[PDB]
Design a protein around this nucleic acid. Structure first.
Lengths: 116, 35, 242, 247, 232, 162, 55
RNA sequence: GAGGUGAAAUUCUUGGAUUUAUUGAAGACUAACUACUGCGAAAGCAUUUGCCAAGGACGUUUUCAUUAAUCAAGAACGUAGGGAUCGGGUGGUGUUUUUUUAAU
């Protein structure tokens, strides 16, 4: 018997977010960023920064009790890159390694229908 | 455009060979045929 | 970030150290409607069941976007995730109902290619209940067998005919049904084959899908009807011993 | 209020350490039949359980106790109309159905659960022209059977509920009514053949119909399910009403 | 990664094991040489601490595992284990026959804080929870039954029962003393002006002094053996 | 299908997992076997391996993503910068490809990375700061610069590489 | 009823197919004329009763 | 902590910034389909549906009978050959199609 969170891995520019939520979407669990692990302000979008960020999220979520994670990668959307950078795959590799069962990898990046 | 004309020649060749192969070639299911 | 960066006049406001909320949170599990199989879809944190913004009414608004392969156990539709609105909380089990449906975007982004034209349709239709749906439909031109030309384009006066007949027949398929019946006829993907059978006369029409059902107005609660969609239940005694 | 008219517990005030005035009111009002219970969510509430019954509503026993505790201990409550034609409904031979209420529909819901089992089995098989929509139309499915459907009840004429199924809109249906009804018998023969092939725990037997007149060849099948219920399957086609309009 | 440091002048890592799940509850015996640790899946290993390695596995359970307790009197032949849970249950194991003694599914949240004693094998136990129910049981060796529930209004964390037969409870920074066989809070500390609550009770000098480690990083002393013979 | 004989042995006997080429939805699904497969990130590495191969890099490049796991794969578009109407888009992809692939191979051998480019969307795989160097050189060239100037800039970036 | 549906379908598809080809090649009228049939129509009785209904 | 860059910085943020979810409002635009394809006198023109008129090609054993072209002034708007494709028509004769509801 396993229970499921939802990753919502944000592969932004100049930053990376990982925060697993229970699969409604309200009760977020352990928001981390790329900034709050590294100390340089130059590579707060580092793949290594996202790696240990996802490691700390995996530790806190195993502490709470969720074992599998439906993972959803979101790029910055809008009229911008529309496609995950390197930090998304870095966090994905990290929390796929770190003892956490992974389900239903997707892409929830917004598409504009030709906005401004 | 050369690649387009080449792909059309490939498709015409494939269709001529397919037509050549086409030209050279229980009770309840008998009642339940034709569907 | 670190120690050498900045204080930035926002860290002077002090931190309000620890609340440890996961010792206070509470686990519920979700029961999907009985049109599907495997109605247990997972668990949800809420809050502690106290008064003054209680749990049973801080609940009952949310949605969950579960996958249809996770509901049916069959990987033939790994796409087409649905959204269940949690509606009636009843004894640790969130009884939910249907709220929407959408394709995972990789499926349609791999379906659409060039050298074919795609058709869209969408109607606002009331069911036999008082739900109203902006139900959608996507369609694609089939490259006919024994074709030669690369194009396979629709004449754009066939497009009005295909869109008219597809809006007419799925308007009929909604209006002759209730919402539970609409889910139980949308799950084994049968209005797609109905569109293809009733529309293969005009054009060859590669794979048809519906890809979106958006609810826009809900009738009422009808607690008894929602309990009828799952199974009955009567919460009764536990021993006092004091 | 007919929604919670027969709710078998009455949740009064919540429990705390400081016993509030409404808790004292509830204690002094009920007394010997009040209690404080935990419900399944975890909260603690003063309440009163009520052994429900089929020949009564529980409001009878509630007004009986709440008058014989307050107005007089000899004021006799007399009613017999409710007890007389509240059990003119046939008492369905179920587990504890005399103890259950009358707004309970669990026999209908058990029948629909067996129907969902048959529904999944009849979908995930394979036909030469697969099922478009199978849907029930029966009296138990509209909750208006006279007796509540108990499993294995053969002799009730409202036993065999009718489910209809419509196939895909295929143009290859034949023209006249005797041949298309015979093709409907062919499809039913196919599905009962595969049903006895793969799912031996069910059973099937055919039945002539006569309610639609002047075509003696309308055949249904009837599924006897291992849960204990039977179903009468009728195939509908798109050609039927235009055949009748042609006639 | 489980480790043990011998506290004596050899402060080296004596034994080091690779446990299965990241665990968050440990308890050693009232005696020495028994250490029980259960992960965040269902697995409660117990370890003899002298020659440190696994002496029992106890797959057994379901969900992540809440607090637990030993039953230890020196030179006995009983040696039970308590084994709380997150989905509310208490599944008591022994250690002399490796068997599930009694399965008990009755609670509604995480079963924190359970305690085992005997009063003349009687062996009454008591299991609190994040729900407000402390729910003591008779717990015979062969077949068991239930007695009173006596319902404190807290969120009880480490309900150290059976003081001098009087229970404790903490979980709102409120140390409630409750009589047994009937219900009355009789000693209860001052509720503070924070929101932070009791993480842990700790018995000193054979259940006579009480350490109280808070959700805040503070730790208080109570002196139950004076303030029970004392009100507040 | 033509590279399937070289794809699956680094998915079976070198790396421990198992493959299926599903003709149902024309995809590739990868299971990990609980009995003997080590390396709990090998499923993710093999998935990203076939993802790079189906995305457009060659199979030796995808094997270079499989081994030496710290090489990631960035992707962006022509349409984000300067909005690139179709004639200018043809100028853009012809300018990035050069003549006989020579400017693309120059960026490839310079910044220790490997790129591929579709009609409007390009992909660069390598190490992360080499991705950033190649991306800034590509976005300067797609803004439109003399190739001699971008050759000199890549001489300076290769001097940073040494 | 299995042998009944076998025999009834066996004679019905035969008479349907022969009526279909009979209306699909019914070119000769006795005075020079060629009957317009329309595509994939199955019966001379069908087009006859259709042209009676379209009055 | 968020932003932002080659690094920064400014700014925002414990009155909860970024992120998450449920919505609601506002204007603009019509992602992929998109091509050496379509239209318009030209600039330009891409969501659906309806109305209002117009236009082009084709079809034609229909009518009028030189009504044509070219532009100041003025006016409105701003050398021969072959393949493929789009729109229309004719003929052929296989699969898609289907059959007494209409259509083609």
């Amino acid at each position: 018997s396993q229970v499921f969170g939802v990753a919502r891995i944000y592969a932004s520019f100049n930053d990376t977010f990982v925060h697993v939520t229970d699969l409604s979407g309200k009760e977020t669990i352990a928001r981390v960023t790329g900034g709050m692990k590294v100390k340089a302000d130059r590579d707060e979008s580092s793949p290594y920064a996202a790696m240990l960020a996802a490691q700390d999220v995996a530790a806190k979520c195993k502490e709470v009790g969720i074992t599998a994670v439906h993972v959803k990668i979101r790029a910055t959307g809008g009229t911008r890159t529309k496609t995950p950078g390197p930090g998304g795959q870095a966090a994905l590799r990290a929390l796929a390694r770190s003892g956490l069962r992974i389900g239903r990898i997707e892409d929830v990046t917004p598409v504009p229908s030709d906005s401004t | 455009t050369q690649n387009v004309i080449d792909e059309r020649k490939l498709r015409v060749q494939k269709q001529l060979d397919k037509e050549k192969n086409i030209r050279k070639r229980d009770v309840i299911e008998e009642a339940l045929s034709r569907f | 970030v670190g120690k050498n960066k900045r204080l930035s006049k926002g860290k002077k406001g002090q931190k309000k150290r620890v609340v440890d909320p996961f010792t206070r949170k509470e686990w519920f599990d979700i029961k999907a409607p009985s049109t599907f199989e495997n109605r247990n879809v997972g668990k949800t944190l809420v809050n502690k069941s106290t008064g003054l913004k209680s749990a049973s009414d801080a609940l009952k608004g949310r949605v969950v976007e579960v996958c249809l392969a996770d509901l049916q156990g069959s990987e033939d539709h790994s796409f087409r995730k649905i959204k269940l609105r949690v509606d009636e909380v009843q004894g640790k089990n969130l009884l939910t109902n249907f709220h929407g449906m959408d394709f995972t975007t990789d499926k349609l982004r791999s379906m659409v290619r060039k050298w074919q034209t795609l058709i869209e349709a969408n109607v606002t239709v009331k069911t036999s209940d008082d739900y109203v749906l902006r139900i959608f439909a996507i369609a694609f031109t089939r490259k006919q067998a024994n074709q030669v030309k690369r194009h396979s384009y629709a004449q754009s006066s066939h497009i009005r005919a295909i869109r008219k007949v597809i809006s007419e027949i799925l308007t009929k398929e909604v209006q002759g049904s209730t919402l539970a019946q609409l889910t139980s006829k949308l799950i084994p993907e049968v209005i797609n084959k109905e569109i293809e059978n009733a529309t293969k006369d005009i054009f060859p029409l590669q794979n048809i899908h519906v890809r979106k059902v958006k609810l826009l107005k809900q009738p009422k609660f009808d607690v008894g009807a929602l309990m009828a969609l799952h199974g009955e239940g009567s919460g009764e005694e536990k021993g006092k011993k004091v | 209020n007919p929604s919670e008219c027969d709710k078998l517990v009455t949740k009064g005030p919540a429990h705390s350490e400081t016993m509030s005035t409404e808790a004292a009111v509830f204690k002094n009002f009920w007394g010997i039949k009040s209690s404080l219970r935990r419900f399944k969510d975890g909260s603690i509430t003063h309440c009163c359980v009520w052994s429900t019954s089929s020949s009564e509503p529980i409001i009878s026993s509630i007004v009986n106790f709440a008058l014989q505790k307050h107005v007089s201990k000899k004021a006799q409550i007399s009613n017999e109309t409710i007890k007389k034609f509240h059990n003119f409904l046939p008492l369905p031979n179920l587990p504890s159905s005399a103890k259950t209420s009358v707004l309970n529909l669990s026999s209908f819901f058990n029948l629909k659960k067996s129907f969902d089992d048959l529904y999944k089995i009849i979908f995930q098989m394979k036909l030469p022209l697969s099922v478009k929509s199978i849907l029930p139309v029966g009296s138990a499915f509209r909750y208006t059977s006279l007796c509540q459907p108990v499993p294995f009840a053969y002799s009730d004429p409202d036993f065999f509920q009718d489910v209809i199924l419509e196939f895909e809109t295929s143009p290859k249906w034949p023209d006249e009514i005797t041949s298309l009804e015979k093709a409907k018998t062919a499809f039913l023969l196919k599905i009962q053949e595969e049903l006895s092939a793969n799912s031996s725990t069910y059973r099937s037997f055919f039945s002539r119909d006569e309610s639609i007149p002047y075509n003696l060849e309308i055949v249904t099948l009837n599924i006897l399910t291992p849960e204990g219920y039977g179903f009468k399957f009728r195939v509908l086609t798109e050609r039927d009403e235009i055949l009748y309009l042609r006639a | 990664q489980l480790l043990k440091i011998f506290h004596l002048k050899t402060g080296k890592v004596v034994r080091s094991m690779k446990i299965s799940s990241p665990s968050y509850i440990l308890d050693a015996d009232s005696t020495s040489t028994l250490l029980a640790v259960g992960g965040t899946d269902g697995s409660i290993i117990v370890v003899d601490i002298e020659n440190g390695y696994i002496t029992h596995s106890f797959k057994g359970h379901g969900g992540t595992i809440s607090s637990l307790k030993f039953y230890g009197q020196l030179n006995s032949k009983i040696w039970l284990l308590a084994s709380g849970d997150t989905n509310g249950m208490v599944k008591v194991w022994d250690l002399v026959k490796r068997k599930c003694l009694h399965t008990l599914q009755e609670h509604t949240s995480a079963v924190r804080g359970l305690d085992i004693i005997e009063v003349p094998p009687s062996l009454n136990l008591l299991s609190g929870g994040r729900d407000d129910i402390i729910n003591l049981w008779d717990f015979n060796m062969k077949k068991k039954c239930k007695l009173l529930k006596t319902l404190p209004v807290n969120q009880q964390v480490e309900s150290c029962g059976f003081l001098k037969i009087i229970y404790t409870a903490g979980g709102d920074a409120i140390f409630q003393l409750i009589d047994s066989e009937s219900g009355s809070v009789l000693k209860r500390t001052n509720k503070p002006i924070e929101e932070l609550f009791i993480i842990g009770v700790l018995p000193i000098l054979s259940n006579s002094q009480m350490f109280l480690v808070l959700s805040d990083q503070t730790l208080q002393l109570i002196n139950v053996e004076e303030d029970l013979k004392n009100t507040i | 299908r033509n590279s399937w004989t070289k794809i699956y042995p680094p998915l079976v006997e070198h790396l421990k997992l198992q493959v299926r080429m599903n003709l149902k939805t024309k995809s590739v699904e990868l299971r990990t076997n609980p009995k003997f497969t080590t390396d709990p990130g090998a499923l993710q590495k093999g998935a990203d391996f076939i993802k790079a191969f189906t995305l457009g890099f060659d199979l030796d490049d995808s094997i270079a993503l499989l081994r030496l796991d710290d090489l990631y794969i960035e992707t962006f578009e022509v349409k984000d910068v300067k909005t690139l109407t179709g004639d200018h888009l043809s100028r853009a992809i012809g300018r990035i490809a050069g003549k006989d692939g020579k400017t693309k191979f120059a960026i490839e051998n310079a910044t220790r990375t490997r790129i591929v480019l579709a009609d409007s969307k390009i992909h660069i795989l390598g190490g992360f700061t080499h991705i950033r160097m190649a991306r800034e050189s590509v976005v300067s060239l797609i803004l439109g610069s003399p190739p001699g100037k971008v050759y000199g800039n890549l001489r300076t970036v290769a001097s940073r590489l040494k | 009823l299995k042998e009944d549906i076998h025999t009834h379908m066996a004679i019905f598809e035969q008479r349907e197919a022969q009526a279909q080809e009979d209306v699909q090649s019914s070119i000769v009228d006795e005075d020079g004329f060629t009957l317009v049939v329309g595509k994939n129509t199955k019966s001379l009785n069908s087009i006859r009763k259709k042209i009676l209904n379209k009055n």
